[PDB]
Symmetry: C3
Subunit: 21 residues, 3 copies
């Protein structure tokens, strides 16, 4: 559960970084 929320929210956010560069 913890890893799911941490990895899910965190992975989507790093994706924001990649999209904006």
């Amino acid at each position: 559960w913890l890893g799911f929320i941490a990895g899910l929210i965190a992975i989507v956010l790093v994706t924001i970084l990649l999209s904006s560069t």
Copy 2:
């Protein structure tokens, strides 16, 4: 429930990331 947390942390994280730029 969990999605609720995922959404609030996600919006705050994108804001701190931009603020730290």
Copy 3:
């Protein structure tokens, strides 16, 4: 519970910023 998850995941992401930059 909520603050713990937000703060814990959020602090990890800030680590990504310092780790990348």
